[PDB]
């Protein structure tokens, strides 16, 4: 009910163009009722006078009528095709742009395949409602109103018999249309489910072949595919069950016309001529009634898909504070105030996180697996917000500053390297689009990235594969390091920056890397403790609490956890 | 042509679907004339004995067509859906057999559209055909025969009406097919644009280039809507032309009809019958023209489906291959040379070294040496151009793929976990592995400490990509998963890159203890973790640098000294 009003709600600015569609469809329908009648009426004035008296004169009249009607149906289809695709385009655009506003906390939990299906399949599914189902509806309502007036002109009493079956006609349609939409919605969610396994398995097939999960992922697919088959048949059957079921109601209707025209035919009233004529008038009324009842059932297919489209449009998106402040004259002051954060909100991940970082400081966040180092970084990037605590970037709180200006001041190098499927040049150009080739090539030469780019088939213009897996795992890291160093932020995050990069090449950057790192605040995460030892402040993390703090030399003689961490690198005791 | 093989097992439902349509067309066309025969006898005789008796008979005929109508839908929907459902499972099986290269030939974003949309286009074709597969020819062949007795010498006009109608759909096939293919090609772009923002939303938000991707989507969305209107314009342009030939056909009937009155060949009321037959011929002609429009959309989608099925995988199992029930672990390389692209320089070349079974081997080198690439030759993930790989002093190609891969376990450089739970993810190596077995492997990989400290233990939800955990935890899980499989040949591509130095020690010493008869290989970047191995292997630029003890490589092997220098001085 509500979804239908919202679906047709996208046709609201198109109303001015839609009025013309109603005009052109009515003119072509009136010409489509007169033309088969005129050929049967003028034929009587052909057999009686004969010769070339009236035979070639009527051909020029009919020739212009048939040409005007043929041009009318073409004009109707041409203007509707443009309008149909523009409603589809706007619906597709409104979905992708909603995803860019939606928080990260949706992407990780929901399957990727179902999202793609909701744009590629579900919006291609609402093509059966636009154009074809619109022209036919407006043609359907004019022929129904055009025939009901003809029936009342013949007999008012006999028209009420054909009108008493109309509430029962709407009754059967509403029972079918409710089930048709019910099965078609289930068909689309299982399609998105199947789309989930397709996307997931393809993007990670190398892992599947390695652990020989070929039949296991096949049975995981077949469990959803056989379920899609069982709902698919139910959707298709219910879609095409209304036309033959309505043909039964028509045949039962004509059986009652001959039935009542038998008992009443015994008396002086009701003639043989009156029954045969009223059948012809009821036929011109049943035909649009069958079509309008079927179209309402055929649009349920689109209604079920549009229902999945509005679910994404109803999702709660990222919202900034009304008094959003744009951070001007960024220095690099970072401060945490008794921060407590949990992802599942049940098991607290960060238990009391508090530290002060002055601008232009190299901070080395260190600690064991699953401590909360990446969590402190993610909260700073405002991907997630603190339950009870404060993050003050350059004096102002993280909540008051808009996400748009907060991310403008901070550049990142993620733990799990992600790369776009464009040219190497366009991938490094992310974060700073104003970067010239003189900037790009000099930066890449300093981070040892340019060493392997000049060996590629198209060089800097080599179009990368999805996630850039056509390169070595360390090679990808060096690309992400440059990307952020080109973006030139006042605050930089080097979360697991040189994990897959070798110890020898990592040192070769270090000197040139720090030259670009000076005059900026940088939080570096690494388990290569002997590289991050020269940082201005070292924050040792454990379970999600700050255990040891200060400079390297001070923490070594302390013989605490940092000493236990550092000595563990070298297995020589 | 090969697409029919999937409709072949469901031929019982495929042959009964048009059979019910014949029952339907008879019970709908003959019933109004049969009902009139009851009316005709109702005025001739009347009474309760003739009107009421035929009143029961007319209800029966109405029920036959009703069951015949709904019966046509059921027999066709079951056949159309089962065609698509069996087509998808045969395509997914072929995509599962594909090698990393075959998944990159067709784009990852295109394969999704092929396995879903391109199946649906063919699925709708079977549905559209089955309904008017017997309705279209029987109303055309049976339609002209009824008109043949009415018109004399007007047969030549009917034969001349065939070529302009044939040209109307032949032009729609010539220009249609490449344009309808451009629609399915443009969907692959909006599929890629959405997947790019989905896999790595954190990268888009960090650099605020959300508007850039919004513009990137608008550039591809406009590309799709314009690709649709370009192919669909052919259908719009064919409408005034096809309708005009029907009007021109009626003009030919009226012109030649008046001549027949002068010659006295057709009666005064014979024009009523021929105008009714002319409508049945044109309506049946429109029925062929409608399914042919679905054919051009389906043919463009058929090519995309068939090319995935006919695509030979880069890694194939030999017909006369001998299955290996037991693997000792005798790893050996004989002048192995591999290249990814013909235009580029060789990745690996002149690699020849023998590996003892059970012994731990440390593999070190610079970024872009070929450590991961060489380790991919062992479970047959890549085939070399020159030279051969030998497992148990026998070629890898001669051994069955499913048997060979079952004995070799690996820990990839980029750890990727899948949907389900920790237990559901760990059971990838061996689904037959009982709770007692999977726990001991997790006690080696230190991950068991944390596994139990979750809301449901091993049954704690793991989301696509493992993204619902910490970097090192994904890595810690990945180690235990390879140990679960119980191998005789083990590969550890940067095993503890995202793990602390304390846990790092605990994992390595936990491995040696449980690898007493397993050819273990560890791609390491650290010198103190490389000493734990029996024979240390060195790789640089592509060729093999040195194979021997730590005392030998410091004086003989040149690149080894360079990596060692960055760690000690």
């Amino acid at each position: 009910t509500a979804t239908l009003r919202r679906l047709l709600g996208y046709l609201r600015p198109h109303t001015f163009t839609l009025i013309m569609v109603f005009v052109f469809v009515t003119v072509s329908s009136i010409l489509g009722v007169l033309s088969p009648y005129l050929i049967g009426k003028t034929i009587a004035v052909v057999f009686v006078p004969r010769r070339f008296d009236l035979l070639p004169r009527y051909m020029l009249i009919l020739g212009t009528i048939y040409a005007l009607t043929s041009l009318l149906f073409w004009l109707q289809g041409k203007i509707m095709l443009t309008l149909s695709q523009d409603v589809v385009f706007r619906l597709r655009k409104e979905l992708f742009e909603k995803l860019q506003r939606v928080p990260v906390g949706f992407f990780d939990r929901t399957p990727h395949g179902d999202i793609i299906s909701r744009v590629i399949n579900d919006v291609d599914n609402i093509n059966n409602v636009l154009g074809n189902s619109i022209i036919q509806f407006f043609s359907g309502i004019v022929t129904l109103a055009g025939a009901v007036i003809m029936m009342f002109r013949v007999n008012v009493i006999l028209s009420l018999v054909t009108l008493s079956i109309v509430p029962l006609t709407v009754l059967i349609t509403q029972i079918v249309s409710s089930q048709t939409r019910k099965y078609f919605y289930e068909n689309q969610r299982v399609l998105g489910q199947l789309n989930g396994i397709i996307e997931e398995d393809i993007s990670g097939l190398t892992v599947i072949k390695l652990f020989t999960r070929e039949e296991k992922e096949m049975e995981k697919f077949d469990r959803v595919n056989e379920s899609l088959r069982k709902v698919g048949t139910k959707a298709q059957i219910f879609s095409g069950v209304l036309p033959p079921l309505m043909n039964m109601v028509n045949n039962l209707g004509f059986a009652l016309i001959s039935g009542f025209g038998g008992w009443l035919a015994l008396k002086d009233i009701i003639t043989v001529g009156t029954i045969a004529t009223f059948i012809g008038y009821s036929r011109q009324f049943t035909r649009p009634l069958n079509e309008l009842s079927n179209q309402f059932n055929m649009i349920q297919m689109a209604l079920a898909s549009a229902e999945r489209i509005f679910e994404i449009l109803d999702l709660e998106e990222e919202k900034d504070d009304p008094d959003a402040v744009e951070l001007r004259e960024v220095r690099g002051e970072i401060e945490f105030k008794n921060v407590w954060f949990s992802y599942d909100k049940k098991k607290p991940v960060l238990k009391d996180i508090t530290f002060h970082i002055k601008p232009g400081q190299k901070v080395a966040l260190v600690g064991p697996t699953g401590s909360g180092k990446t969590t402190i970084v993610n909260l700073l990037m405002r991907f997630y917000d603190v339950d009870r605590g404060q993050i003050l970037v350059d004096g102002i709180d993280i909540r008051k500053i808009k996400r748009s200006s907060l991310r403008s001041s901070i550049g990142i190098v993620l733990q799990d390297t992600i790369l776009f499927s464009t040219t190497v040049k366009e991938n490094l150009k992310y974060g700073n689009p104003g970067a010239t080739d003189e900037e790009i090539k000099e930066a890449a030469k300093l981070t040892h990235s340019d060493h392997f780019i000049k060996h590629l088939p198209e060089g800097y213009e080599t179009v990368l594969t999805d996630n850039g897996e056509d390169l070595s795992q360390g090679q990808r890291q060096l690309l992400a390091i440059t990307r952020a160093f080109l973006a030139n932020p006042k605050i930089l995050i080097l979360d697991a920056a040189t994990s897959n990069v070798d110890t020898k090449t990592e040192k070769s950057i270090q000197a040139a890397m720090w030259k670009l790192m000076e005059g900026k605040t940088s939080i570096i995460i690494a388990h290569r403790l002997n590289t991050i030892k020269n940082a201005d402040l070292i924050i040792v993390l454990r379970d999600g609490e700050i255990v040891e703090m200060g400079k390297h030399d001070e923490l070594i003689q302390k013989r605490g956890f940092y000493y236990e961490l550092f000595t563990s690198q070298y297995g020589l005791v | 042509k090969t697409l029919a093989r999937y409709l072949k097992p469901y031929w019982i439902f495929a042959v009964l679907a048009p059979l019910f349509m014949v029952v339907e067309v008879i019970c709908d066309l003959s019933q109004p004339t049969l009902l009139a025969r009851i009316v005709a006898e109702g005025i001739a005789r009347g009474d309760f004995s003739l009107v009421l008796k035929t009143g029961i008979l007319m209800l029966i005929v109405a029920l036959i067509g009703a069951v015949g109508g709904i019966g046509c839908t059921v027999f066709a929907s079951y056949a159309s859906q089962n065609f698509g459902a069996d087509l998808r499972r045969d395509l997914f099986r072929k995509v599962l057999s594909f090698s990393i290269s075959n998944v990159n030939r067709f784009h990852t974003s295109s394969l999704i559209t092929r396995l879903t949309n391109d199946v649906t286009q063919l699925q709708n074709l079977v549905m559209m055909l089955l309904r008017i597969v017997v309705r279209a020819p029987l109303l055309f062949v049976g339609g002209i025969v009824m008109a043949v007795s009415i018109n004399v010498k007007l047969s030549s006009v009917l034969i001349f009406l065939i070529p302009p109608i044939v040209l109307l759909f032949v032009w729609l096939t010539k220009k249609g097919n490449p344009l309808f293919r451009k629609i399915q090609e443009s969907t692959d772009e909006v599929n890629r644009v959405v997947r790019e923002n989905l896999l790595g939303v954190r990268v888009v938000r960090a650099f605020r280039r959300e508007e850039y991707e919004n513009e990137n989507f608008r550039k591809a969305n406009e590309s799709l809507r314009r690709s649709i209107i370009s192919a669909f314009s052919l259908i719009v342009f064919a409408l005034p032309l096809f309708i005009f030939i029907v009007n021109m056909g009626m003009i030919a009937v009226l012109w030649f009809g008046g001549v027949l009155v002068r010659n006295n060949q057709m009666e005064i009321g014979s024009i009523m019958a021929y105008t009714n037959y002319l409508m049945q011929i044109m309506f049946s002609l429109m029925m062929i023209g409608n399914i042919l429009n679905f054919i051009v959309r389906a043919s463009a989608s058929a090519k995309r489906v068939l090319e995935v099925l006919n695509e030979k995988p880069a890694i194939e199992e030999a017909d006369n291959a001998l299955a290996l029930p037991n693997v000792e672990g005798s790893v050996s390389f004989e002048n192995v040379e591999f290249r990814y692209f013909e235009n580029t320089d060789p990745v690996l070349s002149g690699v020849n070294f023998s590996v003892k079974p059970g012994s731990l081997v440390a593999v070190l080198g610079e970024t872009g040496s070929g450590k991961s690439t060489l380790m991919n030759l062992i479970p047959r993930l890549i085939d070399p151009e020159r030279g051969r790989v030998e497992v148990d002093e026998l070629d890898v190609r001669t051994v069955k793929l499913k048997d060979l891969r079952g004995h070799i376990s690996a820990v990839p450089q980029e750890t990727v976990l899948f949907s389900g739970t920790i237990k559901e993810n760990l059971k990838w190596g061996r689904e037959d592995a009982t709770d007692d077995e999977i726990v001991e492997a997790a006690k080696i990989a230190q991950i068991h400490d944390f596994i139990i400290s979750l809301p449901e233990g091993y049954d704690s939800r793991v989301e696509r990509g493992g993204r619902n955990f910490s970097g090192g935890q994904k890595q810690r899980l990945s180690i235990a998963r390879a140990l679960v499989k119980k191998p005789k040949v083990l590969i550890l591509d940067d095993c503890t890159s995202s793990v602390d130095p304390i846990t790092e020690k605990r994992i390595l010493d936990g491995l040696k203890r449980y690898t007493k008869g397993c050819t273990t290989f560890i791609i390491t970047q650290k010198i103190p973790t490389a000493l734990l191995a029996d024979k240390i292997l060195v790789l640089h630029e592509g060729k093999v640098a040195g194979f021997g003890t730590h005392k030998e490589l410091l004086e003989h092997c040149k690149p080894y000294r360079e990596i060692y220098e960055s760690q000690f001085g």
Partner: nanobody
Amino acid sequence: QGQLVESGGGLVQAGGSLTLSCAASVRDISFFAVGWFRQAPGKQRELVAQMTSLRKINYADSVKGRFTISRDDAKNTVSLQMNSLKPEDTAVYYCHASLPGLPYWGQGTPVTVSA
């Protein structure tokens, strides 16, 4: 962990010779650099002999040529041979263990040059 044991020292005549042994217990020298320092009453801890794991020796220009360093990899001990002792050598000699930012110092061997 780390532990350093110093052997030798005592008193010796001017322009003579002496051997200073630095034993490293519960530690393997083969990976970290070896060092030698000295502290005279009113003088800073000035470097004597520094040798990295890759064999690269850097003696101080004021004690250069005269002093010779030795590292026995199978024994796990670092020796410092003294030749022609001057009155400047009258200081408590210390041994040094390197490792990347993780050092350990010696106890101090007594050296007194008589004139």
